[PDB]
Amino acid sequence: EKNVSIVVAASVLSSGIGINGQLPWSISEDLKFFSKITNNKCDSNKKNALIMGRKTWDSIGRRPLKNRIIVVISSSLPQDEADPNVVVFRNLEDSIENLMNDDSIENIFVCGGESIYRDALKDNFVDRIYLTRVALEDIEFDTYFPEIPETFLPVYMSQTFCTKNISYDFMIFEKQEKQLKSIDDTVDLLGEIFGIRKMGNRHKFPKEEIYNTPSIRFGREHYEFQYLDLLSRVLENGAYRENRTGISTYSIFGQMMRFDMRESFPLLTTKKVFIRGIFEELIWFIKGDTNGNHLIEKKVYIWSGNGSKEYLERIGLGHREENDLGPIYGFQWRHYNGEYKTMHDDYTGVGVDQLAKLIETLKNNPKDRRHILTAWNPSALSQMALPPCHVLSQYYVTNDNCLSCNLYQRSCDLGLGSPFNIASYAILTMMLAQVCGYEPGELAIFIGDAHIYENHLTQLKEQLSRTPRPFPQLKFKRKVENIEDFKWEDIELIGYYPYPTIKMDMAV
Amino acid sequence: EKNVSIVVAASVLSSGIGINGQLPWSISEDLKFFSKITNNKCDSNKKNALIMGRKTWDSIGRRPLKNRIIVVISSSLPQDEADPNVVVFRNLEDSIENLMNDDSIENIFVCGGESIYRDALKDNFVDRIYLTRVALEDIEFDTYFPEIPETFLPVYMSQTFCTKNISYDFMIFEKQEKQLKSIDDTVDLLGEIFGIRKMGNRHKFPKEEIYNTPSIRFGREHYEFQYLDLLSRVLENGAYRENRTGISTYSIFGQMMRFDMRESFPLLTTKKVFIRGIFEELIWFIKGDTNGNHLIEKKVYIWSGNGSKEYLERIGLGHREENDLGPIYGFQWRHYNGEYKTMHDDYTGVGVDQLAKLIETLKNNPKDRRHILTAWNPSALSQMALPPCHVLSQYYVTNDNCLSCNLYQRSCDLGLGSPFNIASYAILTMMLAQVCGYEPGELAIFIGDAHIYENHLTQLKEQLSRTPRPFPQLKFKRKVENIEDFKWEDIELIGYYPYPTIKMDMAV
């Protein structure tokens, strides 16, 4: 037997791979990959064979590839005994005698051409596939990688990467057909004896019917699986509970998520997110605004519910204006400990400006361990339309001049609250970094009460039924002098190709 | 071939298994385990031989064990053809023949007894060794397990369990002799290509030279490993960097640790922990004290350093008395936003009782998601001997009436700070529970700057060279009617057997 792997790079949505004999994009790390993969081998005294269509041979330059043997499939091309590091065959099946001898060849890579992929697949010759998904999708194509036959299952998806503002993943479908017992069993037994008494059982591993792309067992790199998995994790152990809202949830306590911000922008793809809204709110915070209306005007309604005459009236703040939200986030960011009257007053100069002292210590003293911004002020709470969920964040300058962020969130609405929460604090960290001359670090969100509203069940289950695409890229069209200066227009969202929106009602 | 595992239960410290023919303790769950392991089989038509020395046969009642076959090793016992579930052999080596036929016997267990254990081992008959460590060392024994030969390596260790106040582990030692590549390779490659651009590379798996009990790969269940590893994980990616003191540290950002409290007390065993200090400080906080003297008088000198006049002066608080630390934790706990004057004043009635409320909230509103207690108050930081390190915590009542805790720490000194932070916060929860009538739940700790001070390495290296023993148990001797009434006398620390104490100087 001998191994056969396809190696290709297609657009994320339509699988385009070619245009007028050329690749539709130029990503050097990808070829660097293609090289490393096609070339990796055990027997130093052996070489890998890369089968490829002629039309490709032409694009390749009709010149050999170092250390390897090119194998062209053509009907006209002459079997040239001239170069020993290339050879022609009249058809794909015949070419696949590399196994049947030529014991010098260790592995075999089907190396592309729409025609040459489709056939290597139809005739069932390939075992693995090394698929590079390129985020970028709105530009003419004439060649296309086929539809990965159902006999193939994703077993790896690398983290999203970026080159020239083009995002891309490296995932490797394998075709399957067909640590020790000791430990797994000892634990299973100890699991029966002791019951809920063994913490292990309090945290059970999600069932496959609620696991997103369950075929990807050991290589869930893509940091979207940090949320899709927390999702499925409460869906498994979430304990049913009532709460103030009137809509019971399923909740565990003490979770964590992570995100890379260097090569991508953790805007979920398994569902189309309201990015603009996410923004107009985050800026609303930075400005230190608390007038719910200033968002209704830019057509953002995330803060109507917890805002209204009726709700207000109901929680003890009916003395409040239709939409005066009291000293919520922002007022606490820009005016800590300020004596709040109404959303109409001029609060300038009152209260501690955390945000400001933050930027200031950020750039003046980087390795300081007190880059904290908080929103939990006991003295205030009762006046707020709702207490702080993202309660306190802490910011951290790496040695390589990168800004990392840590957020604690007491109550996380995995359905509606989180997607926004992950994005927002990404963006705020970038703005923060751009203003202090540093670049995106990482993102860690620590949740206390991670829950799912019972009326978000059929939805989150669909979302979990979608395989993650590459995270897009977020860019600022200009550098600003003051952090409170950004505008929606100053933002470039590049390469966002999410699944359609999933409608979910809010639990007021 | 055919497997031969040793099953035994010995005291943590001296491996005591015997006393006047009786097990020196009675733990049903342990026996339950034994029954489960010696019955674990694959072929419904086969059985497992359990080998024991006569002396044990006697202790077990000379009655057969359901579903298994007992093999007694004795010189005088007759070869009674009477029972078909029991049989006698003259010498161990003999016996084990078993094997050399009886395709009926699927697995073999040496159910032990000092004389047989020793001999079973010396002649290299045993493949595995299931060992139940029992946290009670201070009783007289007369029979011991032998010393596990070097040829054996621990591959698993269970979390600590508790029965009748007795703490114990379940671990399994395997004997050494001699994922799917495709991924570990595609990931290693992308690792070369991309560099520190691939997040995975900024988080690198610790090297064996610094990994605790590295033989335990997939079975690191003990929750001492939640800290022992965080340690070995900065020791790997720890970015060297300066800070306000003369001692620099190696740090990473965004780490997490988990601890059970339902069956144990996360007191580090790898080294002897000042527990009485951890306490006195906590009770100090609870009372809402800020006079660092009160700790000195009780022979607790942790707040000496950050309290000296030479220090207070150094940070611009020279107007402060010898040890008035200011509105640090406790004043923030019991008097949030209180206008701090001196440590001798009467703050009763001033500020916000967070603790007070936290309690009335835990009792009257459990499912409430705003169970929160903060110490980070922007307005007070300035006049604060040292800013808040355990910055905020959130508490959580399970559906089965257990109290859980979550802590965000902005700056964690894994050398000295963390250890205390883990305990001091176990305890506080347990206390809160005994006062709201709940039982301990889980404890999670989300860290920010996780660092090591560069003058702790030789120490933490030592600590790390030690195999963690089972966690102790901590119970209260009386039910206080008011949280602040607790006293050290009230604490019972049962089953603590930590390795020698490790000296480490603090960085003022």
Ligand SMILES: NC(=O)C1=CN([C@@H]2O[C@H](COP(=O)(O)OP(=O)(O)OC[C@H]3O[C@@H](n4cnc5c(N)ncnc54)[C@H](OP(=O)(O)O)[C@@H]3O)[C@@H](O)[C@H]2O)C=CC1
């Ligand atoms: N994203 C990726 O990984 C890759 C993308 N691409 C893109 O796709 C394009 C290549 O696709 P495509 O144009 O289909 O070229 P192909 O890779 O399909 O090459 C097919 C060539 O092989 C010969 N051939 C086809 N069938 C047979 C047969 N049965 N027997 C003998 N010879 C045969 C043909 O020449 P003849 O008429 O002489 O038989 C033809 O020129 C390129 O433009 C490139 O941009 C290419 C490779 C990889």
Ligand SMILES: NC(=O)C1=CN([C@@H]2O[C@H](COP(=O)(O)OP(=O)(O)OC[C@H]3O[C@@H](n4cnc5c(N)ncnc54)[C@H](OP(=O)(O)O)[C@@H]3O)[C@@H](O)[C@H]2O)C=CC1
């Ligand atoms: N904690 C735990 O998991 C366990 C603890 N224990 C404790 O340890 C003690 C074990 O008893 P101990 O006497 O030390 O050992 P055992 O009782 O296991 O075995 C000794 C008996 O086995 C026979 N025997 C063993 N080896 C030989 C041999 N080579 N040739 C002939 N006969 C042999 C002897 O019979 P004879 O003298 O007639 O030749 C002797 O009576 C028990 O008292 C028990 O309390 C026991 C099992 C498990």
Ligand SMILES: C#CCN(Cc1ccc2[nH]c(N)nc(=O)c2c1)c1ccc(C(=O)N[C@@H](CCC(=O)O)C(=O)O)cc1
């Ligand atoms: C988190 C957070 C901040 N907030 C503030 C906020 C206020 C009250 C809340 N109440 C409850 N029960 N859960 C919340 O998440 C929540 C969040 C948000 C509020 C609403 C939406 C929301 O309804 N999003 C919908 C609407 C999208 C659209 O308008 O097109 C969505 O599908 O994303 C998002 C964020």
Ligand SMILES: C#CCN(Cc1ccc2[nH]c(N)nc(=O)c2c1)c1ccc(C(=O)N[C@@H](CCC(=O)O)C(=O)O)cc1
């Ligand atoms: C954490 C925390 C609270 N605190 C307060 C506190 C204040 C400033 C700090 N500063 C730094 N750099 N690290 C700290 O751990 C630290 C801790 C502690 C302070 C000291 C010790 C300490 O010296 N422990 C020694 C002493 C043991 C003994 O003599 O009994 C130890 O080995 O355990 C522990 C806790």
Ligand SMILES: Nc1nc(=O)c2c([nH]1)NCC(CNc1ccc(C(=O)N[C@@H](CCC(=O)O)C(=O)O)cc1)=N2
């Ligand atoms: N995954 C993948 N990515 C691609 O860009 C790609 C692909 N597969 N399959 C075919 C193809 C088009 N043909 C070719 C032929 C040769 C090289 C090439 O440059 N090979 C060198 C790369 C060395 C480098 O880029 O540093 C090699 O090392 O083999 C690239 C594409 N391109």
Ligand SMILES: Nc1nc(=O)c2c([nH]1)NCC(CNc1ccc(C(=O)N[C@@H](CCC(=O)O)C(=O)O)cc1)=N2
């Ligand atoms: N590791 C270890 N732990 C033990 O507790 C232990 C051990 N090894 N080896 C021998 C032993 C004592 N042997 C036995 C044998 C039978 C019973 C019994 O009456 N019933 C069960 C024991 C546990 C249970 O109650 O289920 C049995 O297996 O026979 C008890 C102790 N106990």
Ligand SMILES: O=c1ccn([C@H]2C[C@H](O)[C@@H](COP(=O)(O)O)O2)c(=O)[nH]1
């Ligand atoms: O930043 C935010 C805004 C609020 N919510 C969700 C969390 C809880 O579902 C919710 C309800 O409120 P509380 O009962 O926890 O206060 O709003 C978020 O998840 N994150």
Ligand SMILES: O=c1ccn([C@H]2C[C@H](O)[C@@H](COP(=O)(O)O)O2)c(=O)[nH]1
């Ligand atoms: O609960 C505690 C008490 C303080 N420290 C240590 C952490 C740092 O070494 C120092 C905090 O000083 P800053 O550099 O973070 O301001 O004290 C702890 O680790 N944990």
